[PDB]
Amino acid sequence: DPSGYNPAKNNYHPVEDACWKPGQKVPYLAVARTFEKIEEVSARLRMVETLSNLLRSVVALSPPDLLPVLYLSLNHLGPPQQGLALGVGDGVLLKAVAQATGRQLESVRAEAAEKGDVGLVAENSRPPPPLTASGVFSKFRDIARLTGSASTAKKIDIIKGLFVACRHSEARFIARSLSGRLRLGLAEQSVLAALSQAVSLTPPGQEFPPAMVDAGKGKTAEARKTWLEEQGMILKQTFCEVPDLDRIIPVLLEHGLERLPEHCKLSPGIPLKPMLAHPTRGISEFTCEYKYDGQRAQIHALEGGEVKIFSRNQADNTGKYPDIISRIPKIKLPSVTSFILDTEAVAWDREKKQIQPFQVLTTRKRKEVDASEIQVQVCLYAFDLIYLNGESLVREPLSRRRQLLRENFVETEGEFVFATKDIEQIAEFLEQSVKDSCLMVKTLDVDATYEIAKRSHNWLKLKTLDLVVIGAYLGRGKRAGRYGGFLLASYDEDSEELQAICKLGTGFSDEELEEHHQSLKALVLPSPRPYVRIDGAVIPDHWLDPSAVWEVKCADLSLSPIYPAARGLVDSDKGISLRFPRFIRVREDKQPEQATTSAQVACLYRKQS
DNA sequence: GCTGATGCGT
DNA sequence: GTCGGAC
DNA sequence: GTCCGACCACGCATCAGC
DSSP structure string for A85-98: -----HHHHHHHHH
Q: Are A267 and A238 in contact (CB under 8 A)?
A: no
Residue A426 burial (C-beta neighbours within 10 Å; 0-12, 13-18, 19+): middle
Whose CA is closest to A303, among A244, A417, A391? A391
Please tell me which residue lies nearest to nucleotide C7, judged from CA to C1'.
A43
- Cα dihedral sign, A544-A545-A550-A552: positive
**3-class DSSP state for residue A84?**
coil
Across the strands, what pairs with A575? A560
- Cα dihedral sign, A305-A274-A312-A430: negative
For residues A226 and A244, give the distance between their C-alpha atoms in angstroms, rounded to a whole number: 26
Residue A340 burial (C-beta neighbours within 10 Å; 0-12, 13-18, 19+): buried
Q: Specify the nucleotide whose C1' lies closest to residue A42 (CA).
A: C6
Whose CA is closest to A503, among A540, A530, A542? A540
Across the strands, what pairs with A298? A310, A342
On whether the A465-607 domain is CATH 3.90.25.10, my answer is: no
Residue A478 CA, nucleotide C4 C1', distance (Å)? 11
CATH topology of domain A82-178: DNA ligase i, domain 1 (1.10.3260)
The verdict on whether residue A497 carries a ligand-binding annotation is no
Helices (H), A102-220: 105-115, 118-124, 133-145, 151-164, 170-178, 188-201
* Superfamily name and number for A277-461: DNA ligase/mRNA capping enzyme (3.30.470.30)
Residue A564 CA, nucleotide D9 C1', distance (Å)? 14
Instruction: Give the bases of strand C that a protein CB approaches within 7 Å.
Output: 1-7
How many CA atoms within 13 Å lie on the side-chain side of A488? 29
For residues A406 and A418, give the distance between their C-alpha atoms in angstroms, rounded to a whole number: 8
Structurally, what CATH architecture does the domain formed by A2-75+185-263 represent? Orthogonal Bundle (1.10)
For residues A405 and A389, give the distance between their C-alpha atoms in angstroms, rounded to a whole number: 12
Experimental determination technique: X-ray
What are the φ and ψ backbone dihedral angles of A466, each rounded to 5 degrees? Answer: -120, 105
Using only the alpha carbons of chain A, give its radius of gyration: 27
Question: Which residue type is seen at A463?
Answer: K
Domain definitions of chain A by residue range: 2-75+185-263, 82-178, 277-461, 465-607
Residue A469 neighbours by CB under 8 Å, 6+ apart = A486, A487, A488, A489, A520, A544, A546, A547, A548, A550
Ramachandran assignment for A559, one of left (phi > 0), alpha (psi -120 to 50 degrees), beta (any other): beta
**The two domains A2-75+185-263 and A82-178 share their CATH topology (first three levels equal):** yes
- Cα dihedral sign, A586-A587-A593-A595: negative
Whose CA is closest to A55, among A75, A74, A34? A34
For residues A31 and A598, give the distance between their C-alpha atoms in angstroms, rounded to a whole number: 53
Residue A579 CA, nucleotide C1 C1', distance (Å)? 9
Q: To what resolution in angstroms was this structure determined? A: 2.8
Give the strand pairing for A307-310 and A497-504.
unpaired
